[PDB]
Enzyme design. Structure first.
Site, PDB file in Angstrom:
ATOM      1  N   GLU A 257     -12.552  -0.666   0.101  1.00 59.52           N
ATOM      2  CA  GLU A 257     -12.612   0.636   0.725  1.00 59.52           C
ATOM      3  C   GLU A 257     -13.819   1.402   0.234  1.00 59.52           C
ATOM      4  O   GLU A 257     -14.144   1.441  -0.969  1.00 59.52           O
ATOM      5  CB  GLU A 257     -11.445   1.576   0.356  1.00 59.52           C
ATOM      6  CG  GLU A 257     -10.079   1.048   0.683  1.00 59.52           C
ATOM      7  CD  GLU A 257      -8.933   1.997   0.289  1.00 59.52           C
ATOM      8  OE1 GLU A 257      -9.157   3.213  -0.034  1.00 59.52           O
ATOM      9  OE2 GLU A 257      -7.811   1.427   0.333  1.00 59.52           O
TER      10      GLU A 257
ATOM     11  N   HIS B 122       0.836  -1.200   0.000  1.00 60.47           N
ATOM     12  CA  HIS B 122       0.000   0.000   0.000  1.00 60.47           C
ATOM     13  C   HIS B 122       0.877   1.259   0.000  1.00 60.47           C
ATOM     14  O   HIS B 122       0.710   2.155   0.813  1.00 60.47           O
ATOM     15  CB  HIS B 122      -0.984  -0.031   1.216  1.00 60.47           C
ATOM     16  CG  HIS B 122      -2.176   0.852   1.087  1.00 60.47           C
ATOM     17  ND1 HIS B 122      -3.453   0.375   1.349  1.00 60.47           N
ATOM     18  CD2 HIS B 122      -2.332   2.162   0.789  1.00 60.47           C
ATOM     19  CE1 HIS B 122      -4.320   1.344   1.169  1.00 60.47           C
ATOM     20  NE2 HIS B 122      -3.667   2.455   0.853  1.00 60.47           N
TER      21      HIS B 122
ATOM     22  N   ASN C 280     -12.286  -0.490  -4.630  1.00 61.47           N
ATOM     23  CA  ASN C 280     -12.407   0.707  -3.837  1.00 61.47           C
ATOM     24  C   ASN C 280     -13.325   1.696  -4.559  1.00 61.47           C
ATOM     25  O   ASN C 280     -13.288   1.866  -5.772  1.00 61.47           O
ATOM     26  CB  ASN C 280     -11.004   1.361  -3.603  1.00 61.47           C
ATOM     27  CG  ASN C 280     -10.093   0.543  -2.766  1.00 61.47           C
ATOM     28  OD1 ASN C 280     -10.470  -0.486  -2.199  1.00 61.47           O
ATOM     29  ND2 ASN C 280      -8.784   1.009  -2.678  1.00 61.47           N
TER      30      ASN C 280
HETATM   31  O1  LIG Z   1      -8.104   9.316  -0.130  1.00 59.97           O
HETATM   32  C1  LIG Z   1      -8.730   8.398   0.765  1.00 59.97           C
HETATM   33  C2  LIG Z   1      -8.187   7.020   0.632  1.00 59.97           C
HETATM   34  C3  LIG Z   1      -8.368   6.542  -0.745  1.00 59.97           C
HETATM   35  N1  LIG Z   1      -9.268   6.887  -1.685  1.00 59.97           N
HETATM   36  C4  LIG Z   1      -9.032   6.162  -2.825  1.00 59.97           C
HETATM   37  N2  LIG Z   1      -7.953   5.384  -2.619  1.00 59.97           N
HETATM   38  C5  LIG Z   1      -7.477   5.549  -1.386  1.00 59.97           C
HETATM   39  C6  LIG Z   1      -6.332   4.920  -0.742  1.00 59.97           C
HETATM   40  O2  LIG Z   1      -6.384   3.485  -0.866  1.00 59.97           O
HETATM   41  C7  LIG Z   1      -6.336   5.399   0.710  1.00 59.97           C
HETATM   42  O3  LIG Z   1      -5.082   5.065   1.279  1.00 59.97           O
HETATM   43  C8  LIG Z   1      -6.711   6.875   0.928  1.00 59.97           C
HETATM   44  O4  LIG Z   1      -6.430   7.259   2.282  1.00 59.97           O
END
Ligand SMILES: OC[C@H]1c2[nH]cnc2[C@H](O)[C@@H](O)[C@@H]1O
Ligand SMILES: [Cl-]
Ligand code: NA
Lengths: 443, 443
Positions: free
Chosen positions: B349, B119, B291
């Protein structure tokens, strides 16, 4: 009347990616400037080096220009990816042939070649392996340099390892404004250190392969003045001189460590055991090249990234917005003698960008550039009278060309190039300089 | 009443750099996010991950919050440079210890671990060798994946290779907004391709080392709508979905080439002979993680680099400015099933940022997050009703944390974190989501 020493080398300078075009002709590999310029947003107007001055085709005409002007030396660079398309391994004979013709032609005509081994066009294949961030580039660069020495060192006797390694490291890898377009302070300082290691390996190889010639390195330099009599403005000047000027690199070469104020700012960004490489870095060099264009007023400033900011002055400026300060070329020359006493020094670039136009009369009346050049040549002469061993002076540039992130919008040539036709028109500054070279000085 | 299937997995998600702090504790190597965030100008207010939520020290408490809430899964990542400080070679026992205690605690409490291998915190040591630009990273990543599988695979049986490779490649190497902060489109497409190659190597190693485990990969997705019913805008949406969403990676993994409109744009940027790697890239996967956060309205535009521009809409927005379009989660779930028909899908997510305040009561009344989440989970339910094999849903995030280039200014947690004291305050969304898990559904 200011006459220079007998045999003083009056020159002009260019760089491969800026003038050549045809970056992928005859089996050349991509450079980082090819990929950087082809990325939207990185170069003004989307300009690239795809065509440039078409010197890759028009090189004979251009050298005939140098010959007709009576200029005695030509500083040019070799494109690494034309020679080794993957950076290491395979050698491209058509690339060697391109530069062989240029070298043979200059020698036929009595013009001294000064070859810049690296003027910023790293092979893209090496950038994929980290480029200047990878310690292994000292080996890659030495292998490249050994190819050049073995092919050209019978004829070329004046070599430069790196052009403006500060720019390469900091503008390329911290500011992200030049290729490879990164913004990482720890990378930029690893690049500084690898640039020194690569420089030194190439000088080591040069001693084994070209028993007759001389090798040096070129630095960008500004004339920094303090904004006040405060001790903090004086120290901000000390820092900018040590960081931005020749000391970043000559302190290692001559003294075996980085300058004190660079260490204060950047120790955490250098490799942990960086001193282990310093004895190798001290490989003896034959000359120092200094580039000089501008002066800056500088002040301490608490909110700036290195505690320094520039203060604009109401002084004449070029089209780059750069302040014209001819005394700077005297100062840096005096200062390099005082600090490191190199055996020979060259002004390997000095020049100016102005908004040149072709008048109804067919001519380019660049009196602004004449004035700039005359004043800096006079200050150079001064330093000679006071004992600086200045052996030559090179005007940047022969030709208007690709000015990196500014593209074609900035014309530094003593020869105008009409990019729609590729016609060359010698500017009044070019005629003026030819007379300076013929007389061996100013009158 | 929207009840979800039996055994539906309800989760929360974090990432290592975003929560841990102590990036150099216990023999850990620097990551590219450490060096990128310690570069001035890259992160809002100069924030870094030096401290974050101090999960490196406060991990037991945080897991206890997950327990007290009855959340059944925890998606977290492993910091590569804690495990292999130089990227390859020597394993750091202390890094192994850190995650083993987290893994043991989760299992004792009956919380199912979903481990993200990558990540975004690449070891700095590997960035100096070109990082994701270097073909060699497929071996480096395979080696790293092995170490994780051999030390942790006895207990962790649900694994994700990569989080959001589009972001890693494009935002880290084309836009320069994320580490390593480059802007080069040729590099960015080589990174896309090496991401696929490294993923596939890891899955091949996973099959040889983990018994009865599942492995998948996570993609960022947006719900793109056309600004008008004009042919050109509909084709702009198709390009955005193909490039920005799962097809960029799933077309290679399931069909053995990149999507057609991606190739029309980007064939010149991909490596020579890239298609030679496609048969290896098709290594079978067990699930696709999606996500999803937001929707965008787009239009054709002959002046934008990809011939596409976004267009603002007057819809409810989060603190990031991102348009709240819950129907996008249904659309993306339906579309992945129609286009690729993966055997399992997870929402890995989904979440939102709002300006969250602590009131006199010492609670945080984030109705806005509750509304956001409730609407998305309901669109997810609907997808399940139309036959999408959705197996779980993870809320981004458990804790307010380091939001990459936005720093600490954007709070996504269902638990609030007072950075002055490191005090956890469960938010109302936390208690509301607690309910959802209990009821395996809404109301
Ligand atoms: O910006 C918000 C979160 C997000 N949004 C789309 N991808 C992600 C990432 O996986 C994550 O670490 C970020 O904190
Ligand atoms: Cl290295
Ligand atoms: Na193959």
């Amino acid at each position: 009347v200011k006459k220079f020493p007998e045999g003083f080398l009056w020159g002009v300078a260019t760089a491969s990616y800026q003038i050549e075009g045809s970056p992928l002709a005859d089996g050349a590999g991509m450079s980082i400037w090819h990929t950087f310029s082809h990325t939207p947003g990185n170069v003004k107007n989307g300009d690239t080096g795809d065509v440039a001055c078409d010197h890759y085709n028009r090189w004979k005409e251009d050298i005939e220009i140098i010959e007709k002007l009576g200029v005695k030396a030509y500083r040019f660079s070799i494109s690494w990816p034309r020679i080794l398309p993957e950076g290491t391994g395979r050698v491209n004979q058509k690339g060697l042939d391109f530069y062989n013709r240029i070298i043979d032609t200059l020698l036929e005509k009595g013009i001294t070649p000064f070859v810049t081994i690296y003027h910023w066009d790293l092979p893209f294949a090496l950038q994929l392996k980290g480029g200047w961030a990878n310690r292994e580039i000292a080996d890659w660069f030495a292998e490249y340099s050994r190819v050049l020495f073995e092919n050209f060192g019978d004829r070329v006797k004046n070599w430069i390892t790196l052009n403006e390694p500060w720019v390469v490291a900091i503008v390329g890898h911290l500011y992200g404004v030049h290729a490879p377009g990164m913004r990482d302070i720890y990378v930029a300082f690893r690049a500084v250190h690898n640039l020194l290691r690569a420089h030194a390996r190439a000088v080591k190889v040069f001693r084994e392969t070209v028993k007759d010639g001389k090798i040096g390195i070129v630095f960008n330099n500004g004339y920094f003045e303090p904004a006040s009599e405060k001790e903090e403005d004086i120290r901000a000047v000390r820092f900018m001189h040590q960081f931005n000027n020749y000391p970043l690199f000559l302190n290692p070469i001559y003294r075996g460590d980085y300058p004190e104020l660079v260490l204060e700012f950047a120790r955490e960004y250098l490799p942990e055991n960086y001193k282990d490489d310093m004895s190798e870095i001290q490989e003896k060099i034959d000359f120092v090249g200094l580039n000089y264009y501008s002066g800056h007023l500088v002040k301490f400033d608490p909110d700036a990234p290195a505690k320094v900011s520039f203060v604009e002055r109401d002084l004449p400026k070029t089209a780059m917005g750069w302040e014209i300060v001819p005394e700077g070329i005297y100062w840096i020359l005096k200062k390099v003698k005082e600090e490191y006493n190199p055996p020979e020094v060259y002004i390997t670039e000095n020049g100016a960008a102005f908004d040149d136009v072709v008048s109804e009369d067919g001519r380019v009346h660049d009196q602004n550039r004449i004035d700039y050049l005359k004043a800096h040549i006079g200050q150079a002469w001064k330093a000679i009278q006071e004992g600086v061993p200045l052996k030559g002076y090179f005007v940047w540039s022969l030709l208007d060309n690709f000015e990196w992130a500014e593209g074609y919008s900035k014309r530094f040539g003593i020869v105008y190039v009409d990019y729609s036709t590729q016609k060359r028109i010698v500017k009044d500054s070019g005629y003026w300089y030819s007379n300076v070279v013929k007389n061996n000085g100013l009158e």
